[PDB]
């Protein structure tokens, strides 16, 4: 039994920090994302992708809103996506976000 609301994040800022005896969260892997995609579900998938896992501003704002009692979501960008962008940049390949 390993239920956790919020735990210490990794350097990739993915909050669960691996499934461990130490407090952390379970992985929502690729097949789970496929399952939500097959469902007519998009908002909950967006939460699992951004506000629950790797959006620092998103996570802080979500926690403040929930303790305020109003459940509002701010998408932002996953920190893992910025990690991917920086890693591809390190390869010498210019990847940029169009405005």
């Amino acid at each position: 039994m390993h239920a956790r609301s919020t735990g210490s994040y990794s350097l990739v800022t993915q909050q669960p920090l691996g499934g461990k005896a130490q407090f952390g969260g379970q992985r929502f892997g690729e097949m789970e994302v496929w399952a939500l995609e097959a469902y007519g579900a998009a908002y909950t998938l967006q939460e699992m992708l951004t506000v629950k896992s790797d959006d620092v501003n998103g996570r802080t704002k979500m926690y403040k809103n929930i303790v305020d009692g109003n459940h509002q979501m701010e998408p932002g960008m996953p920190e893992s996506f910025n990690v991917l962008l920086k890693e591809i940049r390190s390869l010498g390949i210019n990847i940029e976000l169009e405005d």
């Binding site: 007519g40 908002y43 009692g69 109003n70 459940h71």
Partner: protein
């Protein structure tokens, strides 16, 4: 409490437009001081929003009309 949302799904056919309209209604309930028209009996905001959709008293068109009217009183308040 609603075990199933079928009555809503024939109220709103797409069943994804259902999520959007009832989510806006529940948002109005939580953020605004406005309360659901159908009486609340130990029900969360989303459940009572689905209940209002079930009676047909709330739909996307009615919700848009209501918010437009509210903006109308907002403009009339400034005069």
């Amino acid at each position: 409490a609603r075990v199933t949302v079928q009555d809503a799904v024939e109220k709103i056919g797409n069943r994804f437009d259902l999520v959007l309209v009832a989510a806006r209604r529940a948002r109005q309930m939580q953020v605004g001081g406005k309360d659901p028209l159908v009486p609340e009996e130990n029900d969360k905001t989303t459940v009572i929003a689905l209940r209002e959709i079930e009676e047909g008293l709330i739909n996307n068109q009615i919700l848009d009309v209501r918010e437009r009217q509210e903006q109308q009183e907002q403009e009339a308040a400034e005069l």
